Paper text:
Previously, we reported that T. vaginalis cyclophilin 1 (TvCyp1), a cyclophilin type peptidyl-prolyl isomerase and homolog of hCyPA, plays important roles in regulating the nuclear translocation of Myb1 and Myb3 proteins and forms a homodimer in both crystal and solution states with the active site residues highly exposed. As compared with TvCyp1, TvCyP2, containing an extra segment at the N-terminus (N-terminal segment), as shown in Figure 1A,B, is found primarily in the endoplasmic reticulum (ER) and regulates protein trafficking of TvCyP1 and Myb3 toward hydrogenosomes and also TvCyP1 toward the plasma membrane. When adding TvCyP2, the cis/trans isomerization rate was enhanced so that new cross-peaks due to chemical exchange, such as cis-G54 CαH/trans-G54 CαH, were seen, which confirms that TvCyP2 is a catalytic enzyme and possesses PPIase activity. With the SEC-MALS experiment, the molecular weight of TvCyP2 was measured at ~20.01 kDa in a solution similar to theoretical molecular weight 20.947 kDa, TvCyP2 forms a monomer, which agrees well with most of the single-domain CyPs but not TvCyP1. The secondary structures of TvCyP2 contain 8 β-strands and 3 α-helices, β1: residues 16–24, β2: 29–36, β3: 74–77, β4: 81–83, β5: 116–120, β6: 131–135, β7: 148–154, β8: 175–184, α1: 43–53, α2: 140–142 and α3: 157–166 arranged in order of β1–β2–α1–β3–β4–β5–β6–β6–α2–β7–α3–β8.
Using the ARI crystallization robot, we performed crystal screenings of TvCyP2 under various conditions and found that four needle-shaped crystals gave good X-ray diffraction data, all belonging to the space group p2(1)2(1)2(1). In all four crystal structures, except for forming a typical canonical cyclophilin fold, the N-terminal segment contacted the active site of a neighboring molecule. A detailed analysis showed that these interactions include H-bonds formed by the N-terminal T7, R8, I10, and S11 with active site W141, R75, Q83, and N122 residues, respectively, and also by N-terminal S11 with Q131 of the S2 pocket. In addition, some hydrophobic contacts were observed: N-terminal A6 with active site F80, N-terminal V9 with active site M81, A121, F133, L142, and H146, and N-terminal P13 with S2 pocket Y93. In comparing the hCyPA–CsA complex structure, the corresponding active-site residues in hCyPA, R55, Q63, N102, and W121 form H-bonds with CsA, and F60, M61, A103, F113, L122, and H126 have hydrophobic contacts with CsA. Because both the N-terminal segment and CsA have similar interactions when binding to cyclophilin, this finding let us assume that the N-terminal segment behaves as a substrate like CsA in the hCyPA–CsA complex. Because the N-terminal segment of TvCyP2 exhibits such unusual interactions with the active-site residues, one may wonder whether this interaction is real or purely due to crystal packing.
Numbering used by the authors: 6 to 187
The structure:
């Protein structure tokens, strides 16, 4: 026992490489709460690596190339639309939208990964990262990870958003994958 954590255990690590209008913006690192929400964390991890290949909607189950389509200053940045890329698409690794796995982990602070949805049990590939505490989202959105490195880049992406959410630059997951070197 090494740390005395006030927070869920990080059981898997993954990353995004961010491009803004074609230019590199750096890397964001995430750790996922695999012991708490293992089905949601596995979905996000396989979408990072792309290992499941082609989804039923005719585009890769891979976050690579997907944009951040809604960036709302002092709220959150939202991406993960891997089918149509317009903010209405997406697809999980489970051949269908899957159910809310747990609501125990709450949106207490900036930096948390959580799933976007359109109702109960409609999780897909779309996710969002908090930049403020969002306790009104508790019970509606499954939290399943957190930024562990590169929050400065999250903030950079934030600073490009609007009150409407339409961002002021094309913000792209240039590359992504699982951190496998320890």
């Amino acid at each position: 026992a090494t740390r005395v954590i006030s927070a869920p255990k990080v059981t898997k690590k993954v990353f995004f490489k961010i491009s803004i209008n074609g230019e590199d913006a750096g890397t964001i690192k995430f750790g996922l709460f695999g012991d708490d929400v293992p089905k949601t964390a596995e979905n996000f991890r396989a979408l990072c690596t792309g290992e499941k290949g082609m989804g039923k909607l005719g585009k890769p189950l891979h976050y690579k190339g997907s944009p951040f389509h809604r960036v709302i200053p002092n709220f959150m940045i939202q991406g993960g639309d891997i089918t149509s890329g317009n903010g209405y698409g997406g697809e999980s690794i489970y051949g269908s939208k899957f159910a809310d796995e747990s609501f125990k982990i709450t949106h207490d602070g900036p930096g948390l990964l959580s799933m976007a949805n359109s109702g109960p049990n409609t999780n897909g590939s779309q996710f969002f990262i908090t930049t403020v505490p969002c306790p009104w989202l508790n019970g509606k959105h499954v939290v399943f990870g957190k930024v562990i490195e590169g929050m400065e880049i999250v903030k950079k992406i934030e600073s490009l958003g609007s009150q409407s959410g339409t961002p002021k630059a094309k913000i792209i997951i240039a590359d992504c994958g699982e951190i496998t070197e320890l």
